[PDB]
């Protein structure tokens, strides 16, 4: 799969359930107009294929402000990492290297 094909979160309950139901998770908070978030799309696709044990999803901050707020997302892209039922990390910015390091540590 790819950036284009992953689930795009639109609901809070869905978001909360996702944290509870996935052992390893990454959420890509983005904006359609943000250049840096756009730049990370190819990278995410590579990461999705590279780390099949991790669930990757995305959320449009403009479309779902409630979700973004819940994660205190002020800047994009923000990648929120979750492990064993809870959120445990953030990589803020289009840094593919930092993002992969974070994913590897899950």
């Amino acid at each position: 799969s790819s950036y284009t094909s992953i689930t795009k979160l639109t609901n809070l309950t869905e978001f909360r359930n996702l944290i509870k139901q996935n052992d390893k998770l990454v959420i890509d908070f983005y904006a359609t107009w943000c250049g840096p978030s756009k730049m990370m799309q190819p990278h995410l696709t590579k990461l999705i294929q590279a780390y099949p044990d991790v669930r990757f999803v995305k959320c449009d901050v403009d479309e779902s402000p409630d979700i973004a707020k819940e994660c205190e997302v002020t800047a994009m892209p923000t990648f929120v990492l979750g492990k064993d039922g809870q959120l445990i990390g953030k990589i803020i910015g289009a840094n593919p290297t930092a993002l992969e390091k974070g994913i590897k540590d899950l």
Partner: peptide, 8 residues
């Protein structure tokens, strides 16, 4: 740059 910030 690598980030977009939003001030509301």
């Amino acid at each position: 740059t690598p980030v977009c910030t939003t001030e509301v």
